[PDB]
Amino acid sequence: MKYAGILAGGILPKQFLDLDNKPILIHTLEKFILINDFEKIIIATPQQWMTHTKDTLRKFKISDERIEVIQGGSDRNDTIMNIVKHIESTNGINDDDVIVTHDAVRPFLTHRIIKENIQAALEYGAVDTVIDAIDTIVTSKDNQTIDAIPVRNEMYQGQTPQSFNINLLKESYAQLSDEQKSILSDACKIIVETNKPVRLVKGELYNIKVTTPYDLKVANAIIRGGI
């Protein structure tokens, strides 16, 4: 079975800001609603915003019975595991279950990205949505001087969705210590650190994350430009 997990547990908080007279969260959700194969599309948000989010869905005439709003966690991976735990306590986990986890503030993902994510999770178990690194990547351990500059052709910018077999995600995450979880910049590293493969799905240059005011200006350009 196929599940969507829309991650709105972050901090008016950026996931509810208006983008073209419709909240960013709604733009993303609309993309997930058009996929009929999700058994449930689970939105996780902070406790104080859950009823407000449900109300905002009602405001935009979205009544799809597949949508459930749940309480998120204290960090991003805590939120993903909250969604899996909700699934486990509601439906139980099937051996073939997959979860498509996705940033609420990335409203410009496409049908193709979701379908490739779904298919990639079913076939290989774990997948990251990426594009070729737009810049040369440079590293630093002191924030003052370069430590290393890797070969540019091996570098990718991680985006979302990130998609997983639910049992694989649960068991892998269960293996990590609290310190090992302290560094995880994303969810796919849970899998990498537990020595299972993570597949690549190509994103889009316009699949941006709205985290600064600049990103909202770029997003407005993306929407008015139709892309």
Next chain:
Amino acid sequence: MKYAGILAGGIGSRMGNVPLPKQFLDLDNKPILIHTLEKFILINDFEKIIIATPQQWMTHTKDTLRKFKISDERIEVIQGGSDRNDTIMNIVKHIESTNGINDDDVIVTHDAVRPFLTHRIIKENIQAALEYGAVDTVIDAIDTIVTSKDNQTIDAIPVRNEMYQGQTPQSFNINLLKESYAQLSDEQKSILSDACKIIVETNKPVRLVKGELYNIKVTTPYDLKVANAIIRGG
């Protein structure tokens, strides 16, 4: 002395590595190249602003300078090289044959299609190059960076706090860059697309100067639409 080297070699196509003259595309009724140059003319401390571009584009570059009334006596157009680093060295060699290199000379090298750099970025580059010899303009990674050696599976996912997206300008004390570059083999002349990697690979420090989220490289139609937004709005 302080020199600017504006790198106008084009943007290579995935298949063929054909140079496309993206710097001549229109951004609000002025070529991208003209916006970038206008940013450099405002820095009074530059002794020369040398644009190096392929031989086949030099006349059109000069014609474009004329059409947009760019009359600054410091602007000069020269022939570029076989790759980005060879073009940088074409600029260095031109400086040496014209004025001669001083021990304190620095060169601020910059992508022609990065028109949104700021006065602060340029001044900080100059100061950092004078004091420390080598500088990369960078921003904190916003995305998690992931690696792949086969374009199919992840190889590693490093700590995001240590990852940065490199931009330009990249600025160097000229004799230092020359000495470091002179240390590289003919083979390493092919891999190193980046100019700061010359220095890193030759075991000299490179300072970080922080860039801007909007200091984008205008290389795609998508990037061009966003650039039109950035420009119209500030």
